[PDB]
Every structure is written in structure tokens, then in C-alpha cells.
Design a protein around this ligand. Structure first.
Ligand SMILES: OC[C@H]1c2[nH]cnc2[C@H](O)[C@@H](O)[C@@H]1O
Ligand SMILES: [Ca+2]
Ligand SMILES: [Cl-]
Ligand SMILES: [Cl-]
Ligand SMILES: [Cl-]
Ligand SMILES: [Cl-]
Ligand SMILES: [Cl-]
Length: 762
């Protein structure tokens, strides 16, 4: 109890069954890993490990770009306790479940005997069990730290244990970490355990004894599958350390457990014999005597040196952390040791960055829960961050997935919303990613592909058009762009605009100092806008939508001028004028001013209806109230470009959207539904109209807030938090979807868009 857990921590009971869980609302197959989830461990680009609220290591994102949900049962903390003057102690795995293998271990950690807490990047378990006299807690984390691109990359996790004797008898206590040697868990085509072997490192520095297990393979190949895992522990005063190098994971486990269940002391048996077919594992234990009212603290850690990521198109790359530890895959212990000797400083750095928000008492706790915990996705979103192609440079390219069902890196129409944490907290990455986009503006690929929607054929990448994405983990990230094919992004009317807007946002949100960034991207920017002007068929100064989904709402058709694409256009034209003034490009300034003036008038005349802006000029659903109708004006605010539309009209539109899209949709308890009829019935023109998009809502909430509709902002955002985290929601913690319908069922779990919540902190 007496450990420093913040009140805004999301919490749930260990072993809790959740009764209202959502499921996918589409016909085609889609990922549904259940609600047994937790906050990820692991750095940016290191690959991540999802340890759930029940205690299992179950959501593996170690193969970069893939999601594999499966509990590796030998991966556990276990405990032994014995009250002085009792015949027998007891031993228990801290896992609220059971396996096949390991039948001798003590499974099924009981209900109503502990809690899980999460405030990303930290999570905690507390163990308050009728049969466990000594109270235990653990704080686990990886050093995810804004404006630090070093520790933030590390494939490491720390588990700081606290143990308290409230009783009046002396108790002997042990805490054991077990890990399977997971070399060959993926990337290995034959003989998945063969050549795996475990060794014990005893590092005996003055005041810093470490005992570690290094679990690897005898091969020195340089393959995605090869590397080391390490688990270990730092000696503190009053604890003894014991270990077991090699127990069989594809066995009953009694080789390990009979010695731990006796007195909580392992055999200290080293054995480097490689295995052939049997799965193997290691065990690191502490044992201590706790006197009445005594507290002891002890840190364990877990590293993983898997230096190569491979994508399905053939390319192999080094992971970013290899810059600081090496590339040979023999460095797990160096990574473990750095963590064991520096974790206290890392806790403080995490504290130093969370404090400004946590200590602001004008903000409710639920909003802090959502803001920090939504950050999980930055590590867990199949994040790729390279330090050289294998057998190959200034930069380190970066990609974040849109999601796993739609396995696209950096989908631009989505990162327009989802990119806020990177511009605000890791701006050097954000500027790297946007240079990656600038570099593709004039790539041509005349090779043709089949459009999944209408069936027709189209060119892959047209010169002057911004790509929808920078490839797929199943193909070739950064090299082969436009992996997406359900529509043709080369005629989308939003991407070029959002591109320009993202450029100027990244200038503006990093202090308006970085002229070199504007200089590098300037030509891509002029090109993008010049190309989109060519799509103005009817000569009103605004690109026309073509009676098809030619924008991010990729089944929802727009025709003529639309509020969404049209507002983005005007804002983009305004940003360009500004960049043009900054760089002293008189003719850009003059031209983009002229186009903006004409487009502005005409947007107004075509679309303003007295109450809101019409969805578009030409659809059968033209008079629908769209949640995202003024997305250009939202970005203009963040960009400090002023009114692109009249203040009074923007206020009316927002008020209307709140009144209709939020309030008339399940009593405003679930976010902003995308499309509503002026009669107050949800628009049925497409499935996307009947969906709430979590990131459109959080962005809309931020817009509301900058415009002083503070109560409407937080009420609108609340529905998203509620659905995601709350007992009355749908069980989407650490897998926030793109969307849900009125019944609360979902589409596309683990989704980038909801990172838009950070726009609320601008
Ligand atoms: O949920 C809509 C998104 C989606 N759905 C299926 N594919 C995609 C695209 O990658 C993205 O551009 C769309 O906005
Ligand atoms: Ca037009
Ligand atoms: Cl479907
Ligand atoms: Cl003490
Ligand atoms: Cl390669
Ligand atoms: Cl509160
Ligand atoms: Cl896909």
C-alpha cells in the first residue's frame, strides 16, 4: 500500500473476469486478443513484451510488425513464504491462470488477492493474499523518456520489488524470476530449440553484485532469430541470491519447483549443455528473512538482445539500440547491468516528465489515465527504428504502424492525428519521419495494381502525390511505399494537404526556429499543393471530391466540395503562405494567398447553411453533420494561423456537433459519431458514418477546448476514456481501436489514431 502509485493509474483486480467485452463488428477476420492485456515493456524499436494484468507474458511484438498473443507459461515471478516456527512454507506462481507443461508448479493465483495498476510507462502489481503474511508489490517499467533517444530504445525492463512484514512473526521470503530461452520462438524455420544454452554471470563489483542468466544459442549467425535474453538481480543488504541455469520448459517443471517449494532456495546448478529438442529456461531467486515491520526493496530485470529485424520482403536491419550496445547479439548482460545500476535515475526521469501533468489539479484523473496510457502504442505499434541495413549513414529511419490488421507504416492520413506525441515529446523522430515523406514526393512507380474497392487497375505511385504509407512489415518498410491498395491514394484529396499541415505543425510545435526543416521540405510542399490544385475540376479554387472515397474515410464518398478536404486545403494554403514569408519566396506567398482568398469565399458560399458546414455539395448525404467537418480549422488553431473561417460559424458548428454527434448518440457517453442527419438520426449512407472514430473524437475534443467549449471538450473525450478503460466500457485497455458502433463492438484494435489525445495538451 505504502509504495508510490498515482491515483490516475488505471486499475483492475488480478484474476478479474470482465463481463462486457467488445468484439469485431466486421464480417472479414480481425484481430481480437481478448481483454487480458497490460502495459507494454520495451523501448522504441526494440520490440515489445505485453505482460498482462493476470501476470502472464502474452502479447509478443518481438518480431517487429507482427502481433502474437500467447502466454509463455514458464515466464513468471513466483514467491515462497514461511512463518518462523511453522513446519511448512508455501510457494505460488504469481499468475491468475494455468497452462500441458509445468504441472508441478503452483498455478491459479487466487481472485480478490491483488491488484494491477498502470500509468504508462510504469505498471504495478500488489499482492494481498490471506495465505501470504508478507505483503508484496512490484513496479515494472522501461525507460521511456521524452527528448531522450537513447535509453528510450533499450530492449530492457526493470521489476522493482517491495516486501513488507505487517505481522508480529519473522517470515522467510523468496522471489523467483523464471524465463524460457526463447531463441527460436520466431524467425527460425527448423529445429526451434536446437543449440540453445543458458549460462550464469556473477558480476562482483564493490557494492554492486549482480547475478544474471544469459539465455542464447551456440550459433554466431546474424539472423533475426538469434540473440540473447537475460534475467538477473541486484544484491541488496539482507538478501541472498540463488539460481538454476537450466530447467526443462517442455517438462513438468519439478526439476526447478521441488527445490524452490522446500525452502525458497534454488540449487545453484550451472549447466551450459546446449539443448536439442527440449525447451529450456533459467531461474534467478532472492531469499530474505523479514522481521516484524521490516521493509526490503530488491530490483530484478529482463533484457533482450535481438539485434536484427527482418521484414517479409527480405530486408534485414539493425535495431536502434545496437548503436549503444553493439550488433553481434551477444550483449544481453551489458543491457541488463546498465538497467540494474541506473534504474533509480530512470524512475526519477519518468517522474520528472509525468509531474507537470500529474500535479495539475485542474484536470480530472480520468484524463490523466487516458493521456499517459494511450502512449503504450508508441512502443507497441510494431515500431521500427533502424541503425543500418545488414551488411550495408547519417539518419535512423523510423516507422510506426497504423495498426496490425492494416499493417501499414506511418499511414499519413492517420498520423495527421496520431503523430502528436512524437512532435511534442520526441521531435527529432517526428522530423525524421516527415523528411522520409518529403523524399517520396516525386517518386514514380508506373507499375500497376488492383484496387480492392472497385476492382480497376492503377499506377502505384504518381509523381507529386504524397503516399498513403511507407510500406508494410510483410514487404519492404521505407523502400516500397504505398502498400495499401483498398483504394488508390494517388487521387486522394486529403493526403497532400495533411502533408503540408504536418510540416508546418512540426515547425510551429518545436518553437518556430527550425528554418533548415522548412528549407528541406519546401519543394515537396509547393509540389503537393500545385498537384492538388489540378484536381479543381469546376474552377471554384478547391479540389473536387469525385463521388468516391478519395480520402481517409475510405468507404465514405464525397463529391464536389467537402467540408473535410476543403477546410484542410484552405489551412494548408494558409500554412504555405506563412512558410513562403519565412523563406522569402515572394511568388509562393502571392500565389497561395490568391488561391486561398478565392477558395475561402467559395467554401463559405457552397457550404455554410446557417448552423453548420454541409458534408459536401453533391452527395445524397450532403446535409449530414460531420464530426470532422472543420479539421482544417482545428489544425489552423494549433498552427496559430488564425481564422480560416468566421469565429461565430465555427462556434455554431462545434455546438451543433456536440448537440447532435455526441449528445444524440447514446447520450453522449461514447464519443462523436462521424455522421448525423439534421433530424438527429445517425447517418446511414455508409458504415463509417455510423462509427465513432476514437482519434477523430479526441482531436475534436481538443478543438472544442482551444475554442473555449471546455465542458463540451472533456465530455466528448470522456466517452472515449469510458469505453476504453472503465468497468461500464468495452474492455479495450492497451488496444484502443480505430472505431466502434453504437453497440460498442469494434474495428481495428491497437490503432495509431487515438494518440490524438496529446493534441489536448498543445
Ligand atoms: O479505418 C479507416 C482507415 C483504413 N481502414 C482500412 N484501411 C485503412 C487505411 O490504411 C486508412 O487510410 C483509413 O483511414
Ligand atoms: Ca472544385
Ligand atoms: Cl465487413
Ligand atoms: Cl525496514
Ligand atoms: Cl538486407
Ligand atoms: Cl478526478
Ligand atoms: Cl495488411
Amino acid at each position: 500500500h505504502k509504495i508510490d502509485i498515482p491515483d490516475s493509474a488505471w486499475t483492475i483486480g488480478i484474476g478479474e473476469k470482465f463481463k462486457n467485452a467488445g468484439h469485431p463488428n466486421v464480417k472479414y477476420p480481425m484481430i481480437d486478443d481478448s481483454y487480458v492485456q497490460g502495459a507494454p515493456l520495451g523501448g522504441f524499436g526494440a520490440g515489445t513484451i505485453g505482460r498482462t494484468y493476470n501476470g502472464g507474458f502474452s502479447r509478443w511484438h518481438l518480431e517487429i510488425g507482427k502481433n502474437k498473443y500467447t502466454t509463455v507459461y514458464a515466464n513468471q515471478f513466483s514467491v515462497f513464504q514461511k512463518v518462523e516456527g511453522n513446519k511448512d512454507g508455501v510457494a505460488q506462481v504469481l499468475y491468475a491462470g494455468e497452462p500441458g507443461y509445468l504441472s508441478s508448479w503452483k498455478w491459479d493465483y487466487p481472485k480478490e488477492s491483488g491488484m494491477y495498476y498502470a500509468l504508462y510507462p510504469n505498471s504495478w502489481y500488489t499482492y494481498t493474499n490471506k495465505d501470504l503474511p508478507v505483503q508484496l508489490a512490484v513496479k515494472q517499467f522501461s525507460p521511456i523518456i521524452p527528448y531522450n533517444y537513447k535509453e528510450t530504445s533499450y530492449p530492457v525492463a526493470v521489476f522493482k520489488w517491495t516486501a513488507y512484514n505487517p505481522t508480529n512473526k519473522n517470515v522467510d521470503v523468496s522471489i523467483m524470476f523464471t524465463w524460457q530461452n526463447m531463441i527460436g520462438f520466431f524467425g527460425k524455420q527448423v529445429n526451434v530449440n536446437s543449440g540453445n544454452f543458458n549460462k550464469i554471470i556473477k558480476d562482483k563489483s564493490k557494492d554492486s553484485e549482480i547475478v544474471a542468466a544469459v539465455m542464447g544459442n551456440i550459433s554466431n549467425d546474424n539472423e533475426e532469430w538469434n540473440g540473447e535474453y537475460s534475467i538477473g538481480v541486484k544484491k541488496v543488504p539482507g538478501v541472498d541470491i540463488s539460481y538454476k541455469a537450466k530447467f526443462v520448459t517442455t517438462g513438468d517443471g519439478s526439476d526447478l519447483w521441488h527445490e524452490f517449494s522446500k525452502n525458497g532456495i534454488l540449487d545453484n546448478k550451472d549447466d551450459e549443455t546446449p539443448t536439442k529438442q527440449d525447451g529450456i529456461g533459467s531461474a534467478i531467486a532472492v531469499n530474505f528473512k523479514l522481521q516484524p515491520g521490516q521493509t526490503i526493496e530488491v530490483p530484478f530485470a529482463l533484457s533482450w538482445d535481438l539485434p536484427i529485424m527482418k521484414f517479409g520482403g527480405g530486408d534485414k536491419w539493425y535495431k536502434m539500440y545496437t548503436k549503444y550496445f553493439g550488433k553481434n547479439g551477444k550483449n544481453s548482460f551489458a543491457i541488463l547491468k546498465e538497467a540494474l545500476n541506473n534504474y533509480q535515475k530512470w524512475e526519477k526521469m519518468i517522474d520528472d516528465w509525468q509531474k507537470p501533468i500529474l500535479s495539475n489539479k485542474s484536470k480530472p484523473d480520468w484524463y490523466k489515465t487516458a493521456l499517459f496510457n494511450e502512449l503504450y502504442y508508441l512502443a507497441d505499434g510494431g515500431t521500427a527504428w533502424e541503425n543500418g541495413k545488414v551488411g550495408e549513414r547519417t539518419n535512423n529511419m523510423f516507422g510506426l504502424l497504423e495498426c496490425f490488421d492494416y499493417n501499414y507504416y506511418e499511414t499519413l492520413d492517420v498520423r495527421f492525428y496520431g503523430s502528436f506525441p512524437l512532435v511534442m515529446l520526441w521531435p527529432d523522430i517526428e522530423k525524421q519521419v516527415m523528411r522520409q515523406f518529403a523524399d517520396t514526393i516525386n517518386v514514380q512507380d508506373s507499375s500497376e495494381f488492383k484496387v480492392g474497392s472497385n476492382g480497376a487497375m492503377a499506377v502505384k505511385k504518381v509523381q507529386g502525390m504524397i503516399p498513403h504509407d511507407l510500406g508494410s512489415s510483410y514487404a519492404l518498410p521505407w523502400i516500397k511505399i504505398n502498400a495499401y491498395d483498398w483504394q488508390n491514394p494517388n487521387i486522394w484529396k486529403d493526403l497532400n494537404s495533411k502533408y503540408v499541415l504536418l510540416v508546418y505543425r512540426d515547425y510551429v510545435l518545436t518553437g518556430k526556429t527550425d528554418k533548415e526543416f522548412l528549407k528541406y521540405t519546401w519543394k515537396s510542399v509547393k509540389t503537393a499543393l500545385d498537384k492538388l490544385k489540378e484536381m479543381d475540376k469546376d474552377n471554384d479554387g478547391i479540389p473536387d471530391n469525385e463521388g468516391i472515397p478519395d480520402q481517409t474515410y475510405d468507404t465514405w464518398s464525397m463529391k464536389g466540395t467537402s467540408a473535410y478536404c476543403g477546410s484542410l486545403w484552405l489551412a494548408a494554403l494558409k500554412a504555405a503562405q506563412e512558410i513562403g514569408k519565412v523563406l522569402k519566396d515572394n511568388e509562393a506567398y502571392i500565389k497561395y494567398n490568391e488561391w486561398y482568398k478565392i477558395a475561402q469565399q467559395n467554401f463559405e458560399k457552397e457550404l455554410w447553411n446557417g448552423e453548420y458546414y454541409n458534408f459536401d455539395t453533391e452527395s445524397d448525404h450532403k446535409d449530414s453533420i460531420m464530426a470532422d467537418q472543420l479539421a482544417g480549422q482545428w489544425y489552423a488553431d494549433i498552427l496559430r494561423l488564425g481564422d480560416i473561417l468566421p469565429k461565430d460559424h465555427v462556434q455554431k458548428a462545434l455546438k451543433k456537433i456536440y448537440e447532435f454527434n455526441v449528445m444524440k448518440f447514446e447520450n453522449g457517453k461514447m464519443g462523436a459519431v462521424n455522421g448525423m442527419r439534421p433530424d438527429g438520426i445517425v447517418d446511414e449512407s455508409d458504415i463509417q458514418a455510423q462509427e465513432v472514430w476514437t482519434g477523430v473524437t479526441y482531436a475534436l475534443a481538443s478543438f472544442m477546448k482551444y475554442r473555449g467549449m471546455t465542458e463540451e471538450a472533456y465530455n466528448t473525450a470522456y466517452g472515449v476514456y469510458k469505453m476504453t478503460y472503465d468497468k461500464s466500457g468495452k474492455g479495450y485497455w492497451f488496444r484502443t481501436p480505430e472505431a466502434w458502433t453504437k453497440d460498442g463492438n469494434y474495428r481495428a484494435s491497437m490503432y495509431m489514431r487515438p494518440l490524438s489525445i496529446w493534441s489536448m495538451e498543445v
